[PDB]
DNA sequence: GGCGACCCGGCGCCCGCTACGGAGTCAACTACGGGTAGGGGGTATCGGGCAACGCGGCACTGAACACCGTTGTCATGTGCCTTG
């Protein structure tokens, strides 16, 4: 997702349960690795 | 005469979402006959508006008895005086 411009869906989990598997599976924080290789995925290069 | 190419048909698909324009189009006819449906006309049936009139507590009716309280009342008992 570069920022010369695009749209990104927002999605609602409703149940406690999506809730649940969104706060544990599906978080951004637990997502550091990439897993077609198992490398770092979440710390892009750009500016930084 | 099964192999064989080849030929042909015939088919199967062909990243993702939002968001983003409108446009809309060429050649019968009448007669009948019914039946439904509309309209108003009139009619039986259901629904809305009022004071007595159901109640009830108690209250008055005190009236007529009852419940103590009271000073009415009586015939009948002590204390002093007179005579045996
Ligand atoms: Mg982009």
Same mark, same amino acid.
């Given at each position: @997702?570069?920022? /010369?411009? /695009?749209? $990104? @869906?927002?999605?609602?989990?409703? +149940? !406690?349960?999506?809730? !649940?598997? @969104? #706060? =544990?599976?599906?978080? +951004? +924080?637990?997502? =550091?690795?990439?897993? !077609? /290789?198992? #490398?770092?995925?979440? $710390?892009?290069?750009? /500016? $930084?």
């Amino acid at each position: @997702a570069d920022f /010369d411009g /695009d749209q $990104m @869906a927002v999605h609602l989990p409703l +149940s !406690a349960e999506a809730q !649940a598997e @969104a #706060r =544990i599976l599906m978080l +951004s +924080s637990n997502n =550091i690795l990439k897993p !077609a /290789d198992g #490398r770092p995925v979440t $710390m892009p290069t750009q /500016d $930084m």
